[PDB]
Design a protein around this ligand. Structure first.
Ligand SMILES: [Zn+2]
Lengths: 172, 275, 277, 266, 55, 134, 213, 57
């Protein structure tokens, strides 16, 4: 629930500024929050909104955009690869951990809905877990796995007041 | 049934219309006399459509003008093959000696006459109780027969039910209110019945009334039957019906909006662009 | 106290009959006020013949543009029996005279047949105030609502849709004899006072109301209403490029009936299903 | 409103302008006669481009249509560019260029349309459902599209043609091999077809599943049974919109009836 | 069976892969939706006429 | 449903020509009683399989289906047969119409229980409802 | 009810003579509610002595079901074939009160039946006795119960009768209160709309008065 | 539209397609309502530009 206010407070801080340019630390917070909610349209325009002087001075903004670039092309293995490739500051560390976990639920829902049978090697890349781990995870959720083929088979497991409003409108 | 008397709602409306017509014609309310017919099956009454039988009401005495009824007999026999004379009706309160005299006159025609006394001036909730008919009490000397009231039933056919429903409040006061008042009355009487049953159960629990082992068993069965159709198919059908009615409302809110928009553009074309 | 429908005023009736205001304009009569007793007896006689056909006379008076009906008596049937029974109108003590005839169509809609319109033409020609009632027993029994058939016809040699449910057979008779009569708006009047007090016997039922089974009882009626509304709206569109107001009114009434049925169902569900969960 | 949209456009901050673009405008402030058609055209052109950057092509197409339908007798650059972007957006959201309303000024179809010829032939090639021809026209008219600054909208038309072709497969097939599908939509590879189909399922554009055991894609054309209570909620949301629309329509004609200028001429 | 079906004397269809003949004891009174279709089609043309009355 | 334990006596008073066989090993007597059992079982069942229909009417599967389809196409019995799953569907309720009749039965139970209360304690019943509404 | 004549013959008998008559009651067809007989002081006197097990049998046939008999089979006396069928019928009534769609698997568990044919035969003969009305469903393995008789009552579930009836009464009152609110709201909507159209008509005519000066 | 069927190109079976009247009616009615609402809100804006006399010289 706390993620609702954090995104709004960073957006407002960018709107009003003492000199029209916001602080470097709040730029990374806004970019990370956009990626957490899968709002890639505003994140992409935020990258162009960052002045080149700020982007060149702070290398953190370049790194956070690398993670977003993977999400933009829907490169699931690259989302986990770039998240752990670099070390982030403490003010955006907890939300970026939530971004990595949020990507994990996105992969789980995508496989459960868009796949009737997915090979284990590709399925492990989607979730971001090692191949052996992904084998043990599915049975805990009831998903069937078959040996000698290494293939996973996922499957998805005031009316009265309103009505009198309709009549009153029609009868005037 | 214990006395097997079954009145039809058409008779009550007939008597009411007769009384109202005579009251309007003569200015003041006036006593009326009628003739109830019906089907007799040994121990069954089954009153049906009644006719006028004006007769006479002269001064304080009722004269025997039953020759007019005799002429009306063959007339009503042409349209009612299986219907026969059963009794007569009146408008007033408690029975009177004049009613006794008219009943004595009527017993000349038929052996088992009834006596309906529909009261129009009543101001109390339950309906005036139809007929006070008697088996005629005989004592040594003068007969001095009285009337021994026995219960009545309001058995009605489907056509009568539909007609009565149409005359009753059904579809300034809006149609929503008229439709909802009928439901309010039905739910109110159901609630009164259930509340009185609950009061009897509480009285039996406390000890005011003797413990009847069968009434509480029936009450337990009634309580167990209370969740009517709670199936998943019933819910699916109910939601399908609700969605269908919602679509039928959308198609028609759209029509009303189109009509109002047409009126708006008609008024707009004669205000700005004068062509 | 309202009322005032009763108390037959002889002088006014003779004056309006001698004036003959409907001779000048053909569309004089537009409203038909049937009584409670009239409807009760008419529907009872209509259903007391089953699929067979019944017919009788209906008594009433005329006031301005409205025709009020106070009573109705059946007939034995074409032979001498009907003519002998006709004398009932002047034999009893009643000041209402006779205003028209009613006859049932058991399963053939509510329209007027060719022989029916010819008899109505003759009756209007030699008995100036006359109306024809064409109620349907089967439809009111099946759908639970009474359909009215006040269908006064036009004069001979003069030139100037609702219950279109006849599937195949008699629809041909409907088409040819369609412009020869015009419907009358039926507006029921209750005398109030005694009858309004005595209408509590309807409340005695309380079970057919609580379990009405609407929206399926008259599903065919609503489908027919929508089918009529479709070309009513098409005619409104063709004229536009006020029939649109009439189409909107019909849509409003049909939608109101549907929502009333849904409200009854919701009330029943709240009363019975949502208890002891 | 035009200035706010322009500021939100040059700074690429499209979210602050959203509350001022989600409301349908009713009556226009005359500002003592200082309001002209330029302010009307700019609001519905910049606002349409704001929605385009947010991938909201349903309302972006609506905004462009309003600018085109503005009455005019002289050629306007804003109306010209809005016509160019109207074709591209209608080619992305829909499979064809939506027909303009009848009350469009005759100048649009006689001057603006001839000046927009590269976009009209692009629509014609789009109607042939052949991506290779579409890419040839994009390269041929690359200078025209980049000069008009709408580079990327045309590239989105190329990608949307593949989605349109895949959606047509659902109208004919229950199960199609990935290789066979890639040969009909010219994706050149079963791996490419698998990625294209998976993205469509994620976005909800298609109802399908991927079976890697047999290398087949099965189309499950079962959107909704219109039975759940959520459908009832959707119905009353649309019903409330119509009721509010009717209330405004009835109120504004009641202003006409009480107008002293009115009923004098009636 | 094919000749009878083509002659409309047998109301059903043949499932060839299962060697079946499934009859047509279905298609109840769904004419309400057909009536709603005509209502929707008439309304679709009605909006255009009102908006585009004269200009 | 008439079983074989109450039909041996009836065969005693049958006339000799009425005991003739119908070229199937079944006498005339136990041919109209399996048709009667089938029609009567249509009221106690919404759907029955072929195997269980023959486990109740004897004649397990060869002629249990044949008799079921023979009663239909003649108007004697209402239902349809799905031969793939071997189920005879007799008659089903459409949920909503069943809801109305179940409500009516519930209301009838209230009325019947109301009469019982008044019969047992007429004095207690009378004073009850008058003050209840007020 | 057949139990009335049985009560008269047991008004004075006690001990072994009463016990023999009790067995007749439990076997007599058409008797399914042994409540009035149980309240007799002669029957309750059997609690003390060697007939305490026989009293528990009558309590089992009044309030208990077949699974209760299985658990306490050793203590209770032997039951005849007719008595066991009656207990099975009463078990179906108890299940019918809880739910109106009894699964076949549930019924097979309590009634102790090995095959589906025996269970359906028992249900069919239970419908014949008119204690339960319903239809069998082989495809869904359900017993749709439309009506079941009320079993025996005790002085512990009378409060449950009050609680259920009070809930029904409160639900009826809530519906009535809601209907009254909708009636007045609809009336207010109609009168507010009627006032608006009267104001417009008055304004139009007032303008016409000024113009025609 | 001459054949109402779908091709299953795995077992090579042509399956006849049975459309659902209820689902089809609901989706086309909601589509008509959405189009009508868009058209009405567009013309009610046009009434503003016509009343205010907005045009390009
Ligand atoms: Zn006729």
């Amino acid at each position: 629930f706390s993620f609702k206010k954090l995104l709004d407070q960073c957006e407002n801080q960018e709107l009003e500024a003492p000199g029209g340019i916001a602080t470097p630390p709040v730029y990374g917070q806004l970019l990370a929050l956009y990626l957490l909610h899968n709002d890639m349209n505003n994140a992409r325009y935020l990258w162009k909104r960052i002045p080149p002087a700020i982007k060149s001075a702070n290398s953190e903004l370049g790194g956070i955009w690398s993670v977003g670039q993977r999400i933009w092309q829907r490169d699931f293995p690259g989302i986990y690869t770039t998240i752990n490739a670099h070390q982030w500051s403490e003010t955006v560390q907890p939300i970026m951990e939530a971004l990595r976990d949020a990507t994990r639920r996105r992969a789980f829902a995508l496989v459960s809905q868009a796949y009737t049978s997915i090979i284990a090697d590709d399925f492990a890349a989607f979730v971001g877990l090692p191949v052996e781990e992904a084998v043990k995870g599915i049975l805990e959720q009831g998903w069937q796995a078959d040996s000698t083929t290494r293939m996973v088979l996922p499957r998805k497991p005031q009316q009265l007041a309103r009505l009198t409003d309709y009549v009153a409108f029609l009868e005037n | 049934g214990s006395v097997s008397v079954a009145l039809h709602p058409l008779v009550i409306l007939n008597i009411s219309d007769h009384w109202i017509r005579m009251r309007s014609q003569e200015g003041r309310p006036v006593q009326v006399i009628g003739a109830l017919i019906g089907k007799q099956e040994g121990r069954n009454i089954e009153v049906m459509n009644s006719f006028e039988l004006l007769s006479h009401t002269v001064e304080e005495k009722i004269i025997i003008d039953k020759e007019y009824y005799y002429t009306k007999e063959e007339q009503f026999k042409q349209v009612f093959k299986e219907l026969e004379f059963l009794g007569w009706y009146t408008t007033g309160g408690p029975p009177d000696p004049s009613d006794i005299h008219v009943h004595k006159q009527v017993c000349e025609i038929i052996e088992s006459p009834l006596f309906l006394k529909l009261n129009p001036m009543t101001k109390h909730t339950d309906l005036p109780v139809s007929v006070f008919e008697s088996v005629i009490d005989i004592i040594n000397g003068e007969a001095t027969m009285l009337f021994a009231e026995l219960t009545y039933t309001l058995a009605t056919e489907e056509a009568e039910r539909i007609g009565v429903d149409h005359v009753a409040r059904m579809t300034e006061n809006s149609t929503v209110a008229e439709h909802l008042i009928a439901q309010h009355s039905a739910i109110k009487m159901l609630h009164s019945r259930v509340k009185l049953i609950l009061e009897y159960v509480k009285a039996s629990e406390a000890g005011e009334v003797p413990f009847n082992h069968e009434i509480l068993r029936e009450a337990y069965a009634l309580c167990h039957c209370l969740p009517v159709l709670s199936t998943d198919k019933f819910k699916t059908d109910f939601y399908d019906q609700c969605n269908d009615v919602g679509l039928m409302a959308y198609l028609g809110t759209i029509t009303k909006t189109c009509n109002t928009m047409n009126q708006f553009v008609n008024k707009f074309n004669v205000l700005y662009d004068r062509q | 106290s309202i009322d005032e429908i009763y108390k037959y005023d002889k002088k006014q009736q003779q004056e309006i009959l001698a004036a003959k205001p409907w001779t000048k304009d053909h569309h004089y009569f537009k409203y038909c006020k049937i009584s409670a007793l009239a409807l009760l007896k008419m529907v009872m006689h209509a259903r007391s013949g089953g699929n067979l056909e019944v017919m009788g006379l209906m008594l009433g008076k005329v006031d301005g543009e409205t025709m009020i009906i106070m009573d109705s008596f059946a007939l034995p049937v074409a032979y001498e029996y009907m003519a002998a029974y006709i004398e009932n109108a002047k034999q009893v003590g009643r000041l209402e005279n006779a205003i028209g005839w009613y006859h049932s169509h058991p399963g053939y809609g509510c329209w007027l047949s060719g022989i029916d319109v010819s008899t109505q033409m003759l009756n209007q020609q030699f008995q100036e105030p006359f109306v024809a009632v064409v109620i349907d027993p089967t439809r009111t029994i099946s759908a639970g609502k009474v359909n009215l058939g006040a269908f006064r016809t036009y004069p001979k040699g003069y030139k100037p849709s609702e219950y279109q449910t006849i599937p195949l057979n008699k629809i041909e008779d409907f088409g040819v004899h369609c412009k020869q009569y015009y419907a009358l708006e039926v507006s029921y009047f209750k005398s109030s006072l005694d009858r309004k007090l005595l209408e509590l016997l309807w409340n005695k039922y309380w079970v057919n109301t609580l379990s009405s089974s609407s929206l399926l009882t008259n599903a065919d009626y609503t489908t027919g209403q929508v089918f009529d509304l479709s070309e009513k709206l098409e005619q409104s569109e063709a004229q536009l490029g006020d029939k649109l107001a009439k189409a909107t009114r019909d849509s409003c009434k049909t939608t109101i009936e549907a929502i009333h049925g849904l409200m009854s169902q919701v009330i029943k569900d709240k009363l019975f299903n949502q208890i002891n969960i | 409103h035009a200035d706010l949209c322009q500021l939100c456009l040059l700074a690429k901050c499209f979210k602050p302008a959203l509350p001022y673009l989600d409301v349908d405008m009713m009556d226009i402030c005359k500002e003592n006669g200082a309001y002209d058609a330029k302010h009307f055209l700019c609001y519905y052109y910049y606002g349409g481009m704001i929605y385009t950057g947010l991938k909201n092509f349903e309302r972006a197409l609506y905004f462009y249509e309003q600018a085109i339908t503005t009455p005019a007798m002289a050629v306007s650059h804003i109306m010209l560019e809005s016509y160019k972007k109207y074709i591209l957006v209608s080619l992305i959201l829909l499979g064809k260029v939506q027909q303009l309303p009848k009350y469009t000024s005759q100048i649009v179809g006689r001057f603006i349309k001839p000046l927009s010829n590269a976009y009209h032939e692009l629509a014609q090639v789009y109607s042939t459902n052949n991506p290779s021809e579409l890419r040839n026209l994009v390269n041929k008219h690359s200078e025209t599209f980049t000069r008009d600054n709408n580079m990327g909208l045309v590239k989105q038309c190329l990608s949307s043609l593949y989605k349109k072709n895949i959606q047509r497969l659902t109208k004919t097939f229950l199960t199609l091999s990935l290789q066979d599908m890639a040969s009909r939509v010219q994706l050149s590879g079963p791996q490419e077809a698998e990625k294209y189909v998976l993205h469509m399922i994620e976005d909800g554009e298609i109802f399908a599943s991927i079976n890697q055991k047999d290398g087949m894609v099965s189309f499950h054309d079962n959107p909704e049974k219109y039975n759940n209570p959520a459908m009832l909620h959707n119905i009353d949301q649309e019903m409330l919109k119509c009721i509010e629309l009717d209330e405004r329509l009835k109120a504004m004609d009641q202003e006409i009836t009480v107008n002293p200028q009115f009923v004098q001429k009636s | 069976l094919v000749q009878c079906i083509l002659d409309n004397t047998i109301h059903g269809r043949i499932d060839q892969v299962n060697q079946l003949l499934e009859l047509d004891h279905q298609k109840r009174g769904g004419a309400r939706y057909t009536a709603l279709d005509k209502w929707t089609n008439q309304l679709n043309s009605l909006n255009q006429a009102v908006v585009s009355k004269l200009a | 449903i008439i079983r074989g334990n109450q039909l041996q006596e009836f065969a005693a008073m049958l006339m000799p020509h009425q005991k003739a066989t119908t070229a199937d090993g079944s006498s005339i007597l136990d041919r109209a009683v399996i048709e009667h059992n089938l029609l009567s079982a249509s009221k106690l069942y919404n759907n029955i399989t072929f195997e269980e229909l023959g486990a109740l009417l004897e004649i397990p599967a060869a002629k249990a289906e044949k008799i079921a389809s023979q009663m239909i196409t003649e108007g004697r019995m209402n239902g349809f047969i799905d031969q793939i799953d071997g189920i005879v569907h007799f008659e089903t309720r459409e949920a909503l119409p069943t809801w109305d009749k179940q409500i009516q039965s519930l209301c009838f139970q209230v009325n019947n229980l109301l009469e019982k209360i008044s019969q047992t304690a007429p004095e207690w019943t009378a004073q009850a409802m008058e003050a209840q509404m007020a | 009810n057949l139990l009335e004549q049985f009560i008269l013959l047991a008004k004075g008998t006690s001990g072994s003579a009463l016990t023999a008559l009790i067995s007749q009651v439990l076997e007599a067809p058409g008797v399914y509610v042994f409540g009035e007989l149980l309240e007799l002081a002669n029957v309750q006197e059997l609690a003390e002595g060697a007939n305490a097990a026989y009293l528990q049998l009558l309590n089992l046939f009044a309030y208990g079901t077949y699974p209760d008999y299985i658990a306490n089979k050793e203590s209770l006396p032997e039951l005849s074939t007719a008595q066991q069928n009656k207990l099975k019928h009463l078990t179906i009534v108890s299940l019918a009160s809880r739910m109106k769609c009894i699964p076949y698997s549930v019924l097979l568990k309590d009634l102790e039946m090995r095959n589906l044919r025996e269970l359906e035969d028992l249900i069919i003969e239970a419908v014949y006795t008119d204690i339960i009305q319903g239809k069998l469903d082989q495809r869904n393995q359900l017993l749709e119960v439309d009506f079941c008789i009320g079993r025996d009552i005790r002085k512990k579930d009378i409060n449950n009768i009050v609680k259920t009836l009070h809930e029904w009464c409160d639900g009826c009152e809530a519906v009535l209160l809601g209907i009254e609110q909708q009636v007045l709201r609809a009336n207010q909507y109609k009168e507010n709309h009627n006032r608006t159209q009267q104001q417009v008509e008055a304004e139009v005519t007032n303008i016409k008065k000024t113009l025609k000066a | 539209g001459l054949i109402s069927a779908r091709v299953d190109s795995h077992s090579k079976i042509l399956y006849a397609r049975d459309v659902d009247q209820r689902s089809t009616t609901f989706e086309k009615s909601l589509l008509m309502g959405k189009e009508f609402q868009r058209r009405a809100k567009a013309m009610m804006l046009r009434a503003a530009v016509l009343r205010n006399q907005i045009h390009v010289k």
